[PDB]
């Protein structure tokens, strides 16, 4: 009590960080920012464990302070800056762009992308409102707010954002027959092809979702993130394309193509 917490113990950090239980009794508490604490990947862990570029929090601090790593077009020299879903982490050294997307097994994976692809990013709108002076605006899953949006945009839609300015270049509506990326729950990391939804007047809408292998599951409306249209997807997918092969099938795949 008495005020907000500032430490984060190991075994209490989110499991999708792949942080070992030994080697320290604390984990980097993601600072306040664009994404929630649980569903965020701090730059410390991304540049220390995910990429192994830095062997120490000191080395990550040096990297961030001298500003090689820039997130979403801004340097973001915070040692535990919360970098969550759909963020672009750019390294000017070696000119490499990472898109922060989940893998098949619910973990933020490394995802090399080209410069033109890292130019833009997609964001799910969280709510559309009218700010002061009667200016409509939309808020995204990244905490971004866009003023004077296209009047057609509604809740649960997604926006392709130029990421250089505040303009929304494109937008995709949330409708049946649309390719999504389920973010959270048991199905964290599947490509969607929505079939339909249950409104469930009162809260917690559930949408039914079949991947490419004709496997159908159910997820929550807030839990589902649309990343393109049926056919071509707006952005690239990590290795595996998020289909959640069963454990036996994964065993066969490993034993054959080790």
């Amino acid at each position: 009590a008495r005020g907000p917490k500032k430490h984060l113990k190991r075994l209490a950090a989110p499991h999708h960080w792949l942080l070992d239980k030994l080697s320290g009794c604390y984990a980097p508490r993601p600072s306040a920012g664009p994404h929630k604490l649980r569903e965020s990947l701090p730059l410390i862990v991304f540049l220390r464990n995910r990429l192994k570029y830095a062997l120490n929090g000191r080395e990550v601090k040096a990297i961030l302070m001298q500003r090689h790593v820039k997130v979403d077009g801004k340097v973001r020299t915070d040692t535990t800056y919360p970098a969550g879903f759909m963020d672009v982490i750019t390294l000017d050294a070696t000119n490499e762009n990472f898109r922060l997307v989940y893998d098949v097994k619910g973990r933020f994976a490394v995802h090399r992308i080209t410069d033109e692809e890292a130019s833009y990013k997609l964001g799910k709108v969280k709510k559309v409102q009218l700010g002061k002076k009667g200016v409509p605006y939309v808020v995204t899953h990244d905490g971004r707010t866009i003023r004077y949006p296209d009047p057609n945009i509604k809740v649960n839609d997604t926006v392709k954002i130029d990421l250089a300015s505040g303009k929304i270049t494109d937008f995709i509506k949330f409708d049946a027959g649309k390719l999504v990326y389920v973010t959270g729950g048991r199905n964290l990391g599947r490509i969607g092809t929505i079939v339909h939804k249950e409104r469930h007047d009162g809260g917690f809408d559930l949408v039914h979702i079949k991947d490419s292998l004709d496997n159908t599951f159910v997820t929550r409306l807030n839990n589902v993130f649309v990343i393109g249209e049926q056919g071509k997807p707006y952005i690239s997918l990590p290795k595996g394309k998020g289909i959640k092969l069963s454990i036996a099938e994964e065993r066969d795949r490993r034993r054959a193509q080790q």
Binding site: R10, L11, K21, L22, G24, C25, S246, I247, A248, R251
Partner: protein
């Protein structure tokens, strides 16, 4: 504090401390496989009981169950790789019917004597 490092026992003592048949069998195994204590026999019996319990709880599951299939393949393959299971039978019946003597003869201590570097298991 730091995370708790997990530890577990690797052996179990017999229920009846003084059984003539069990004592004679264990002393026979100790003498003919060159073991320092009966704790080694207890340890091998513990692992054998663990894998037998796993196999039994596997068999209680219906056929074509994904869990039964996967866990059966894993257990059988591990036993074959170590060498206590037959290299031609994945029936899992032998998985419910391994033997402490098989585990002991698979242990390295007798492997040196078998391959002929020892001339005696205690020399090994």
């Amino acid at each position: 504090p730091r995370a708790p490092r997990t530890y577990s026992k690797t052996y179990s003592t017999p229920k009846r401390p003084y059984e003539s048949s069990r004592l004679d069998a264990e002393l026979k195994l100790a003498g003919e496989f060159g073991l320092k204590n009966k704790k080694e026999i207890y340890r091998i019996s513990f692992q054998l009981s663990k894998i037998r319990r796993a196999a039994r709880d596997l068999l209680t599951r219906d056929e074509k169950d994904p869990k039964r299939l996967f866990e059966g393949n894993a257990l059988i393959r591990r036993l074959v790789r170590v060498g206590v299971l037959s290299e031609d039978k994945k029936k899992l019946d032998y998985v419910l019917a391994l033997k402490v003597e098989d585990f002991l003869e698979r242990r390295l201590q007798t492997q040196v004597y078998k391959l002929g570097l020892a001339k005696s298991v205690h020399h090994a």
